[PDB]
Write a protein that binds this ligand. Structure first.
Ligand SMILES: Cc1cc2nc3c(=O)[nH]c(=O)nc-3n(C[C@H](O)[C@H](O)[C@H](O)COP(=O)(O)OP(=O)(O)OC[C@H]3O[C@@H](n4cnc5c(N)ncnc54)[C@H](O)[C@@H]3O)c2cc1C
Length: 436
């Protein structure tokens, strides 16, 4: 515990999901706005954030105990918090499959919700027939959904990810939070007291020093490139592309639920401009490089994001074009011949157990790690920062702290993905620098 009036906190990655949430909650908790500094490479929402997207799925996670609480806190805020409400489109979500194994997995998912005995059945509906699926998704045809079975999350939908992070940044700026970007916002190293162990701020790549009582490293997929996380977090890329619908087609897809099949991927209702985003589903791609983060004695093998923001001409691997097109054929057969654009790789960071890594650095007192999003944490935007502030103040619940603790040793490359990510170096087609 410490004064909220006199304590300075610097948040690194303030343009991102966990960083923005943290900044927001320092301000809501009553920290002096001018004592809060938010740093990022790019002005918020950072072009580089995994959160800078037309959309992310809003759904429920149950694996661990924290999952359930986090998921319910999240939903409550997206539904009722004035700041967040406009960016949650509660169109529901259909999780479907037509394979023997995929359907059994869905029945398992449903059983799981039911087994919790907190009334999840009232917002999660089993869809056993074509009729029930067609009712949730009128764009589908009966022939198309032959043998499909479904779980419908009536509570679910999608999140206007970039807009929501932007709204936080506006709020913070208004309150008088300090910001640093580019050279003045790019983390280089922590600064230490004379003991070499107590963190007292951080220095950026342009040499600017920021002194503060607590530092929060919420740099997302770049976090393990900035400090040695001992393989707890492996950054991986997922992929998406866009297709343009005509005004007529776009009208038809208005308010369609998010549609997801673990064997294919998912798509979202068109944005205001008639554009649908399609994603596949796969274990992600790594991009290992020899890299020496601050504090490391020798260079390490770290998956270093290949950022679309830095490399506008990058697309994604040829293997992704195949799987994206398979998703389109499955979900949007009438659009098979639409041309794709904005082919993009977007980066997240996996831990071995898919839980967050939110904890004080084991050696550097006052330096908090807040990462390990594991590719399903955008929905935690509204609430995750509350628990980061709790950690900062020493009041984080023991079960939550334990789940998120420093815990080197697992296999983050495989995580809970069913397979280790393949490396971009082995997956041709994404790099186009070489017309230059
Ligand atoms: C294709 C794809 C689809 C996804 N779909 C969903 C979904 O449907 N539902 C869901 O809940 N989640 C989804 N996710 C995951 C979600 O986007 C992430 O879990 C979440 O955005 C992670 O937030 P973060 O704070 O950990 O990182 P980020 O949001 O990426 O923010 C990290 C910030 O750190 C900054 N940074 C990097 N280096 C430095 C530095 N040196 N100094 C200062 N700042 C730095 C970056 O610019 C960035 O702004 C998806 C992810 C991907 C890739």
């Amino acid at each position: 515990a410490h004064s909220r009036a006199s304590t300075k906190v610097v948040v690194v990655g303030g343009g991102g999901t966990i960083g923005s949430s943290t900044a927001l909650h320092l301000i809501r908790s009553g920290y002096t706005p001018s004592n809060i500094t938010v740093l990022d490479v790019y002005k918020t929402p950072s072009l580089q954030s995994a959160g800078h997207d037309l959309n992310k799925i809003m759904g429920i996670r149950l694996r661990n105990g924290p999952d359930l609480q986090l998921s319910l806190e999240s939903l409550d805020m997206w539904q009722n918090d004035e700041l967040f409400k406009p960016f949650f489109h509660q169109v529901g979500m259909i999780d479907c499959s037509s394979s023997k194994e995929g359907i059994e997995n869905l029945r398992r998912k449903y059983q799981t919700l039911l087994d919790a005995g907190i009334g999840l059945e009232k917002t999660n509906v089993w869809l056993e027939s074509e009729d029930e699926i067609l009712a949730k998704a009128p764009n589908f045809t009966r022939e198309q959904v032959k043998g499909w079975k479904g779980l419908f999350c009536t509570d679910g939908g999608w999140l206007a990810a970039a807009k929501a992070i932007n709204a936080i940044g506006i709020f913070l700026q208004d309150k008088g939070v300090k910001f640093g970007f580019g050279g003045a916002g790019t983390f280089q190293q922590p600064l230490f007291a004379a003991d070499g162990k107590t963190c007292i701020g951080l220095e950026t790549t342009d040499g600017t020093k920021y002194f503060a009582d607590k530092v929060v490293l919420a740099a997302g997929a770049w976090s393990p490139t900035l400090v040695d996380l001992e393989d707890q977090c492996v950054s991986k890329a997922w992929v998406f592309a866009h297709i343009q619908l005509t005004p007529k087609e776009a009208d038809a897809y208005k308010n369609v639920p998010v549609v997801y099949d673990g064997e294919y991927g998912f798509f979202f209702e068109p944005n205001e401009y008639g554009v649908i985003k399609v994603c596949d589903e796969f274990p992600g791609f790594s991009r290992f490089k020899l890299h020496q983060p601050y504090g490391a004695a020798s260079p390490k093998m770290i998956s270093v994001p290949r950022s679309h923001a830095k490399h506008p001409t990058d697309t994604y691997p040829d293997a992704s074009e195949v799987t994206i097109r398979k998703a389109i054929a499955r979900f949007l057969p009438e659009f098979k011949d639409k041309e794709l654009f904005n082919r993009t790789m977007c980066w997240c960071t996996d831990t071995a157990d898919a839980n967050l890594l939110i904890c004080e650095h084991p050696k550097w007192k006052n330096f908090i790690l807040a990462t390990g999003d594991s590719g399903h944490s955008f929905k935690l935007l509204p609430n995750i920062g509350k628990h980061v502030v709790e950690l900062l103040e020493g009041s984080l619940s023991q079960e939550m702290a334990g789940a998120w603790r420093w815990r080197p040793g697992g296999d983050a490359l495989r995580s809970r993905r069913g397979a280790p990510a393949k490396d971009l170096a082995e997956m041709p087609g994404w790099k186009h620098d070489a017309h230059l």
